[PDB]
Amino acid sequence: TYTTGSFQLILASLEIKPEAHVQELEIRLDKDTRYLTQHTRNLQPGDTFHALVEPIGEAPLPRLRLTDSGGKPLAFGLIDQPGESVELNYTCDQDICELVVHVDGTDGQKDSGEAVYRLLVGINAPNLRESGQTPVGSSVFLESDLVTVGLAVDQIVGVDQRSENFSVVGTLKLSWHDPKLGFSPDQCGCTVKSFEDASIRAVAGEINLPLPSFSFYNQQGNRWSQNQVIFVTPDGRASYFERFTVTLQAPDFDFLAYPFDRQKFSIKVDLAVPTNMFIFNEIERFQQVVGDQLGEEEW
C-alpha cells in the first residue's frame, strides 16, 4: 500500500492548474431543520470555491452564505439574472483556511412541508454546472468519520424490578479509520500501538486528537470495565475493545402482566461526539449477541 503523512526536508509547480473537483448534495428542509451548514477542506491559497443551490420540487430559493471556521463572513449570495438557482464564488487569500457553507430560509420561515434542494459545491472548478466527471474528483466537504460498533451480551446478571434497572455483562467493540492516528513503524518498531486500562476519553485527552468516545446512555453508577484496550495501526485503523458489567436504568419496565409480562432490555450506546465528527455506520457481528449459557435462566 502507499503511505500518507507530514514530513520535513533538509516548491516548483504542478502542471498549470490545480486539481478541480465538484460534488452534489440533496438537502432537505423540514420543520425540525430550517438551517444547515457544511464544512470544507484547507483550500490552499489561490484555490477558488464555487457554490450553487437550486430547488427541485418547488421554488423556495433558500439563501446561501460562506463563512470561515468561526463564522466570520467571507462570501454572500447574489441571485443570477435567469430565474431559479443561486451562484456564489470566493477566492481565498490565506493558507489553511476552512470554509463553512450555510443554507437558510431565514426570510422564508413559512411552514408547509418538507422540501428538497440540490446543492453543487466545487473547488478550483469554474464550471457553471455539474457538467461531467462529477464523482471522479475528491469530495469537497468534510465527511464524518465512519465507525463500526458491535455489542454482545454474555449474560443478564440481574434484574431489579422495583427500581426498574437491570445489570448486564457483555463485550463492546468499536472500529474506525482515522489516519491522523497513524504512525511510521520505523520509530516504534512495531505494527500496533496499544493503549490499556484507559477509556477513549482518556486516550483522546493524552493524544489531543478527536476520538469516538461513547457512553452507556442509561448507565447507573460506575461501569466495571476490563480487557479495555485500543489498538492503532499505521494505516490509521483503530479498534477499541471492552468487557463491561453495567447496570442500566430501564424506565420502560411494564410489570402489569406479571408473571406473563414480556420486557425489552434496551442497551443504548451513545456516541459522545456530534454527528458531523463521527457516526455509527454499520454493526459488527463479531460474535453471537445473546450467547449460550449452561443451565436454565430466569429471563
Binding site: 438551517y35 451548514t37 439563501r63 452564505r65 463563512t67 468561526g70 463564522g71 466570520k72 463572513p73 467571507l74 462570501a75 454572500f76 449570495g77 447574489l78 441571485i79 490565506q94 483556511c97 463553512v100 450555510h102 437558510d104 431565514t106 426570510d107
Partner: protein, 103 residues
C-alpha cells in the same frame, strides 16, 4: 517601540494620539466618531441579500489611509505605514454563531 493597552466595554471607539492582537474576549479589531452609523449599518445588515460583505467597503471606507483590519492572528505581520502629508478599534460587524447568521 510604542505599545498601548486597549480595552473597550462595547468597542464603540477610542482614538489614539499621533502628534496587533487581542488579549481576550471575542473582539475582532480593525477625526470624528460616527455614532448613528452603528445603528444604520446594524439595521441595513439585517434583511439584506448580497450586501453583508459589501457594506464594509461601501460605508466604513471613509476612515481610509488607516485600513489595517486584523480580523485575527492570520496576518501576524507588522506594518511600517506611510504619511502622505504632514499632520476606532474593534466594532467590525462580523458573525460568530454557526447555526444562524446574526451580525
Amino acid at each position: 517601540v510604542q505599545h498601548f493597552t486597549g480595552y473597550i466595554e462595547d468597542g464603540r471607539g477610542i482614538f489614539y494620539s499621533l502628534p496587533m492582537q487581542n488579549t481576550g474576549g471575542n473582539l475582532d479589531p480593525l477625526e470624528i466618531d460616527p455614532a448613528v452609523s452603528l445603528g444604520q449599518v446594524l439595521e441595513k445588515a439585517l434583511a439584506s441579500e448580497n450586501d453583508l460583505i459589501s457594506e464594509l467597503t461601501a460605508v466604513a471606507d471613509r476612515i481610509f489611509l488607516g485600513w489595517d483590519d486584523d480580523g485575527g492572528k492570520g496576518y501576524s505581520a507588522s506594518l511600517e505605514f506611510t504619511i502622505p502629508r504632514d499632520g476606532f478599534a474593534g466594532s467590525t460587524i462580523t458573525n460568530q454563531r454557526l447555526d444562524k447568521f446574526q451580525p
